[PDB]
Amino acid sequence: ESAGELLVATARTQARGEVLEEVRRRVREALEALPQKPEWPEVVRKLALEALEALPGAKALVANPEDLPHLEALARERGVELQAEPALRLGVRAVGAEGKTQVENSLLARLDRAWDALSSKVAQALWG
Amino acid sequence: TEALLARYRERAEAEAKAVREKAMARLDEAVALVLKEVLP
Amino acid sequence: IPGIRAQIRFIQQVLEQREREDTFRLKRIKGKIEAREAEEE
Amino acid sequence: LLKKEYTGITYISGPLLFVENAKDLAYGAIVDIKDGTGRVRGGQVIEVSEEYAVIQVFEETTGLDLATTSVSLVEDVARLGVSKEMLGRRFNGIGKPIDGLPPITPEKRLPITGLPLNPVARRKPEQFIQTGISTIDVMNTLVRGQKLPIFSGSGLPANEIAAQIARQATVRPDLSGEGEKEEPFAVVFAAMGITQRELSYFIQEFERTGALSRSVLFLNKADDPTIERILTPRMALTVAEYLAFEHDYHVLVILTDMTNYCEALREIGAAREEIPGRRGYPGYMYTDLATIYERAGVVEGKKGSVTQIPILSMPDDDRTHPIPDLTGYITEGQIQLSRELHRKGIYPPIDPLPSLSRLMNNGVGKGKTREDHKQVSDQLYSAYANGVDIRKLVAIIGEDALTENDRRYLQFADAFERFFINQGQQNRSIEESLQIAWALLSMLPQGELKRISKDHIGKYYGQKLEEI
Amino acid sequence: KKEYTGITYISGPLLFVENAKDLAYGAIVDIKDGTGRVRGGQVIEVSEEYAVIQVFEETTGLDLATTSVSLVEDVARLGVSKEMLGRRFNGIGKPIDGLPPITPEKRLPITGLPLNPVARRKPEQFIQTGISTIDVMNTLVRGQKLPIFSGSGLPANEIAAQIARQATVRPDLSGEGEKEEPFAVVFAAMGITQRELSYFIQEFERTGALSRSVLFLNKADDPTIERILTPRMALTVAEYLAFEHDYHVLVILTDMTNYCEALREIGAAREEIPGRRGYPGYMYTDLATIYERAGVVEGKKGSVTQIPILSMPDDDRTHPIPDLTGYITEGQIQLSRELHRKGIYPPIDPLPSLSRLMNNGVGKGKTREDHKQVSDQLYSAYANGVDIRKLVAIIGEDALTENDRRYLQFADAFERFFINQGQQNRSIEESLQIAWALLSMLPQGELKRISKDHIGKYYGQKLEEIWGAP
Amino acid sequence: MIQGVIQKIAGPAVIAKGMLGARMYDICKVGEEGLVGEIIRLDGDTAFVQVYEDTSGLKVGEPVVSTGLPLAVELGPGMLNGIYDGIQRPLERIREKTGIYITRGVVVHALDREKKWAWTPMVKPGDEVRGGMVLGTVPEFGFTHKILVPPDVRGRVKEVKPAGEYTVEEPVVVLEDGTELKMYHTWPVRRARPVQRKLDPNTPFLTGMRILDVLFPVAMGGTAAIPGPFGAGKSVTQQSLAKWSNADVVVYVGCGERGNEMTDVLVEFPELTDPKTGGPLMHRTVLIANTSNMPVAAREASIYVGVTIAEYFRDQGFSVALMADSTSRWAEALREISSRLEEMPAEEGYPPYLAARLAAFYERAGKVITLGGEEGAVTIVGAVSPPGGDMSEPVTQSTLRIVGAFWRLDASLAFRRHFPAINWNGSYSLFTSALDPWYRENVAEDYPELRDAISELLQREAGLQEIVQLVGPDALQDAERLVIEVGRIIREDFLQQNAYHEVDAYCSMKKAYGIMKMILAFYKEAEAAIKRGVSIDEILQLPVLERIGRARYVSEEEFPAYFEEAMKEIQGAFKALA
Amino acid sequence: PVQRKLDPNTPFLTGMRILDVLFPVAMGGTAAIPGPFGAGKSVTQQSLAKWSNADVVVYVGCGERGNEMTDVLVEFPELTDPKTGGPLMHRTVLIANTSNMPVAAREASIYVGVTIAEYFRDQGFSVALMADSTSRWAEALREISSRLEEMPAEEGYPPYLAARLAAFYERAGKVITLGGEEGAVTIVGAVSP
Ligand SMILES: Nc1ncnc2c1ncn2[C@@H]1O[C@H](COP(=O)(O)OP(=O)(O)OP(=O)(O)O)[C@@H](O)[C@H]1O
Ligand SMILES: Nc1ncnc2c1ncn2[C@@H]1O[C@H](COP(=O)(O)OP(=O)(O)OP(=O)(O)O)[C@@H](O)[C@H]1O
Ligand SMILES: [Mg+2]
């Protein structure tokens, strides 16, 4: 008798999970195309500024070679270097002065770090 | 009996599909909201 | 008999507690001396 | 947000590791430790200074090294996402689902450390609970908001009694004059180092009763890491408080074995090199157990409630062992099972002499139950104690040396043990339990009923025990 | 002669020597001061900056300016040969009999290696100790570890000397393979005083047992590390003899309690945290490394048998020393202080003793066939008579059942004849004759544990203690 | 690999340097002799290694090499019929190598690299594989040993080897990802092997003995405990467990026994022949032996190695019985190791984490559905030897807090020639309620009630033992004397069981059910006879008692007819005779 | 500070027959009531608070249950002041520091309560003070000493525990106040061994 509604609860929960993962994979696909969007050079500088202000006295900056030409002007006026790296797609990383502390700032990591907070917002929007 | 279990399975399927159809009208709006928030 | 067994258990527990406290104090002072010798130099 | 990585690990030994230059970690913050193989394990900051920080690992430190390991900050304080949709869900004792269902959408993030309730914000517990156990309802009355742990042993069936109480718990609004029919309790069940046998029994009993729809389970199995056992009661209590004080639920909280919690705390303290207590336990165990027990009760200006039934096994049946000793100094009474009654086949093997309830005077009396309740319970205590001491005397001198009144007390004690305490799985009404108590009390002359007023004796004395 | 200088810290038994990275851990060194006196020492901890050495004896005249330290051996070794028989040593292999030193056939590490368990074989042959209570009711089997539990004032040394003097094998009773093999005794004394040393010397000299014995004698005032090392020396020599020259060896260790106290002292010296009751936590492993070096090996005719001797400090069997000994060994021999005070020697108490290998080393083809049943019946009868001895004092002798007087007489006769044998040596057959004679005091049909044919074969005999069992 | 040099030697603990990157709890080889050690602490460029064996003669500056992997066992064919030490080293190879003594630094492979095996492929090229699936079958002593893909490996088959003779080391199946899978794999001993799900215990574990099976049963995948008093027959009971049980493979662990006891168990076992096939019992056993003088670390890890092997065989789809000889000695080894680490004692010197270790070890037992979809189960019967027969001892307190059954052995009953000498007081089993549905479906619909009646009869006998001691059996009332006589009948005709008899050693459930039914029928007939007037000594001489006394020693296929004859004799005898 | 201290020659009526008869307590005296859990220390102290001749009652809930203080707060305003006949709560000062409240505040609560009692004594009243549990104060001292890395003496307690206890218990006693008026302080402390 309660097992009957158990199936209803499980089915609705799995459907909600399916649609929520649909939302997350769609936003993941859209964000990966943002580097191709011409606004990406306008956002890399904001990201590097946030990463550099988050770590006072940072020694160097790490980003993709494709993004280095845009960040080069920002680096000299802040008195920091810039590093080419095969990894670190669509993001910048701020290393500490002593080489022990690092600060990572990329859109995809921010997505995971904000999903826990925004899951309720997404669910309410879907089922308001 | 088995009739009750099958009926509960069918109502569960109906509820799940209704939920999916409800969310299909705002999947795009949810994507827009999350992309807005995760963008700095 | 039960009274004697209870008294024996009581005495044993007291002795074990005293031994444990002695060991803890010994290890604590040993650690302090080791600190003064090695970290402080 | 953005994540900051510290890779300056200096010293690893046992369950603790030191990070050199991580000055920016808040005290008590949660961090994640990542090894060279990509596996991430949890941790918690227990001590932070300018020179370094001390992070205690939630599990074993196998596979960690000083070269490639990195630690990432998670949050300033341990929080938990809660919702109404938690009912019927299952978790691994750290907040992770195991039932295969997708993770829940949080309503809020609340600290598992909790906060001390303001005494002026509390209100006195008043509501009678009818558990269907005469030895509990009549003599050790339980009240909503009370915390009443169970003291048992290795082979004693404490889990069965807890499951029966969960099955049979009711409020009986009619006697109190409220008239308001109420929804059943939502049951929060927390496990600590439980075996597969006990867990299977609990799951099967909850399925048969049909209480899984209103229950939340935090399962920390016996093979699960021991350091994670610390948090499980805290998360369970956080969920219970949230439900009760933000959604007007009536919550019953069950904790399977505080003995495992205390042993894990002892191990952690011994690793921490703290001052031992009486038997190697940490000296702060009283405050730690209080931070868990004190979270029950009821709140003025709100309709919810929280009730705890912790279960613990006394080591070697010693009431003076530090675990039950420190537990009894906090909770409002306890229920101690006796191995002798279990040997004699009595079920439930509840011994009413060492048992006590410190909130019975609140929810018992005129206008709440029958007005003769307290006097009946006190007289039953007196008569049972006299019968037991007479029985102790009998073994020395033999039966024949007794007088008639002493023999009568012996007969009453035997009848009490065989009828009142022993009831099996059946469910008894409070009126039926009072009737049985009066039938037993009828065996003694009216001159012996000193504790009971004349009017109650005149109203209720004279009936026979043959009714059952 | 690689010798170091540069001492930097001396306190009690320890001293630190710097720039000694060549020193191996556990090596033995020699400490020489300015006057040429040379003290022994052992390296206990080796580090890059300095090495830590524990001095054997006191440090009266040492100093930081003129001390010199030189290596002796990377690991402790002892030269062994077939000619060590008839010699005495001070506990580190130094002769003390005044005779010229022996020729070392080979040098062996005293820390012996564990035996391979699949190589071992079941003990099957007994040893005649010459004591009735031990040879009959608590038989000692070749390859056993049967400690003798003693009191404080009880005379254990006399028992040890008597066993060393009277122990021998009985190849005759084996029936087949009637040919004797060499027998030897290894004696280890730890923490004895001058008087006990003199007594042992005299006992081994007056009878001539020195011709088949090796003595390792260590005094109470000797250095502690020597007391620690002595049993390892004795067991190394015993193993060499037994498993190289086909010798049957019996090793007697005296006062394992003194060894335990020395172990406690050394553990406290190394700044190691004491375990339960103040003894080292590794005490069980250290004792197992000594006891477990005896047994019998497939394909070899030799054997090693151990009889540890220890006195319970406060008569407490739950004291850690006898408790761990009981964990490791296969029985015990209990000395009764009442028997000692009543003038009975040797004061062995049959009721609280036990031999766990007894059943497998006696019977057909090994000893006289009726051994086990006689032992069981004697034990039961003595236990039955002991309580009657106490009940008589309250109910009176005239009120006893007729069999109770016979049990009283049997207990008295057993005490006065079986246990109280004095210094005389007894054969196994003579001991069994005495046992049957004592059993003849009881009515036939009260012997529930003995087969009827054995009763018919051996019943009907008067006391043989007066006769001497010809 | 990561290589360093010695900086400081002090006892079994050695400090290394230049080892930045070494992982915790990983096995290191110290010195030219290659002594194995384990890392316990890391700080700076320094690793703290605990050498297993002795460290005499070592010098500062010797090389130290870390293997990069923790302690682990090799899982594959050839582990049957074998003898292993604490860390899974074949003792027979060691004997054939270094003689009768064990030298430090011996290197041998737990699985022989020289033997050939008959490979039988099961997979096909291009198949998807996942951890737990069967790759092939290799015959071994009448068993179909299935090679299992390692649990963590998931991929697709590329190359398969044809059927034939191959050695253990030869790679047989190569996956498309470049990973090579061979006849054996490796598993860390301190991580339990994964499974799909743990089923609840619902079927009995047939121990072959009436008392154990009927009064204090243990289910498949449960746990038990048993004291070890001397002269009580513990070894015989364990041997009968190894011989007559349901378990397909038997695993025995010696974890700190005496040398002579180990010799006894290693000599008795080769002469045993199981009733299943008549072949040597050693073909179904894995012996793990340890003497007290062996290194402490091996004694500590012996139980983990044994339980990991049992887990492997359970994953293979068998039912395994695992016996630990004395967990007290393992606890002593653990206490000594903890004392080496300078850890604060908790109680009686024992470390605080002892209860956690015992619980984690005991939880590995259970009945599961393996990763391959088959069914397997492991049952643990671990004996505990208290110091002086005291159960307040912390090890017994911890163990009795988690096990599902307890078998109180006693020396007094064995002294009275009652075998097995297992007391019915203090002994308890928690599996009876769960086994009641199975008993109803399997043996009889009334078996639980019959067992309860037997238990109540025993309790009635025990409730008046003081009067008989005071008075005596000859001078008693009819009811009490009949109760005590029926109790003695029960004790000597249903609880006792001869281990060395040809047909009495093994008893099924139906045989015991018949015994109990006959006993109850006799008791009710005797009560009716007393009610209508009879003397007890008239009852004693009925032939039904002599028939029940010989209810044992009958064939298990002859039991139905004998039971029917006994029932008819019981019903007819008490009407023709008073 | 006080002017002079006097000997106690007046009884302190606690309203219990056994305590008022067999083991009396004086106005300026001190009493200790130890016992196991469930013995009834709290009930006794609450009964003393309800039925006593003292002018002002100060209750210190040092490290005990919050429900105990909640019940007192709920029920006292309906009771009767034994002497003045007004509400009972008008004469009571409650200092509550429950078990889940910060540990280090247990030590400060005792001193705050005793200082308030001394002030009311200096005003010229006869004040009774109840300490709910000094064992919790001892535990707080032990915890702080552990944090200070001090050397333990007995069950981990710091060696200066008895000095603090004596200093706390010596603030009691009937005195002549600096204003020439008369007053006294009565201290009844519970111990949880
Ligand atoms: N079930 C049994 N049936 C018949 N004889 C038995 C049985 N159990 C034990 N015995 C007898 O006991 C002998 C071995 O068991 P015993 O009572 O001597 O103790 P044990 O197994 O050696 O004890 P432990 O291992 O505790 O030291 C057997 O050879 C046999 O004579
Ligand atoms: N004088 C009394 N009259 C009636 N009941 C009493 C009395 N003293 C104690 N009790 C009973 O004792 C219980 C309350 O005890 P109380 O809380 O005072 O104990 P305590 O010794 O202060 O314990 P703790 O130290 O654990 O706080 C109730 O069940 C109450 O009925
Ligand atoms: Mg209180």
Residue numbers in the entry:
A (entry chain L): 61 to 188
B (entry chain K): 81 to 120
C (entry chain G): 169 to 209
D (entry chain E): 3 to 470
E (entry chain D): 5 to 474
F (entry chain B): 1 to 578
G (entry chain C): 194 to 386
Task: Quote from the publication.
Cryo-grids were prepared using a reaction mixture of nucleotide-free V/A-ATPase, containing the regenerating system and ATP at a saturating concentration of 6 mM. The reaction mixture was incubated for 120 s at 25 °C and then loaded onto a holey grid, followed by flash freezing. We determined three rotational states followed by focused refinement using a V1EG mask for each state. In these structures, nucleotide densities have been identified in the three catalytic sites. Hereafter, we refer to the structures obtained at ATP saturating conditions as V3nuc. The V3nuc structure, obtained under ATP saturation conditions shows all three catalytic sites occupied by ATP or the products of hydrolysis (ADP + Pi). In the V3nuc structure, where nucleotides are bound to all three AB dimers, three distinct but associated catalytic events occur at the three AB dimers simultaneously and these events are coupled to the first 120° rotation step of the DF shaft.
V/A-ATPase is a motor protein that shares a common rotary catalytic mechanism with FoF1 ATP synthase. The V1 domain of Tth V/A-ATPase (A3B3D1F1) is an ATP-driven rotary motor where the central DF shaft rotates inside the hexameric A3B3 containing three catalytic sites, each composed of an AB dimer. When powered by ATP hydrolysis, the V1 domain rotates the central rotor against the A3B3 hexamer, composed of three catalytic AB dimers adopting different conformations (ABopen, ABsemi, and ABclosed). Here, we report the atomic models of 18 catalytic intermediates of the V1 domain of V/A-ATPase under different reaction conditions, determined by single particle cryo-EM.
